[PDB]
Amino acid sequence: QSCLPNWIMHGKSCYLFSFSGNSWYGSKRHCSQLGAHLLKIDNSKEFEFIESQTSSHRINAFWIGLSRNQSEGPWFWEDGSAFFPNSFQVRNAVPQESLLHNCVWIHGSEVYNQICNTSSYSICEKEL
């Protein structure tokens, strides 16, 4: 099958590495504007491809589709599907106390929680 201009084909989907700063919120709207969603990392195969591109773009971090309503709350993907530490675990980045670290980005080969209104790059996914 085919992907759109500037989107990368891999596996069961097309991905767009958006080198443009936005909140997680804005990054979520952008992907959806394009008929897509924030990157769901389903399994280690898909993590491996993602990590090959995120680790060659170290200067940037990339919001993904993982979040939680609040600090005590479970992580969930965009489709509402539950999170499994089948590919990565979320590294708690919080310096001290915080109720705001409720959105997830990837940097290099690691995944961190960050403040949702923080500026970062992003990855969009669209299933073939």
Residue (21 or 45) nearer to Mg ion, CB: 45
Binding-site member from 23, 53, 87, 109 for a copy of itself (CB under 8 A): 53
Handedness of CA 17, 20, 26, 29 (dihedral sign): negative
CA gap 89, 34 in Å, rounded: 28
Binding-site member from 34, 57, 100, 115 for a copy of itself (CB under 8 A): 57
Sequence-ordered alpha helix ranges (H) in 1-128: 24-33, 44-54
* Angle (CA) 100 106 108, round 5°: 135
Is 98 annotated in a binding site? The answer is no
Sites of contact with a copy of itself (CB under 8 A):
1-3, 5-6, 8-10, 14, 17, 19, 52-53, 56-60
List interacting residues with Mg ion (CB under 5 A). 40, 42
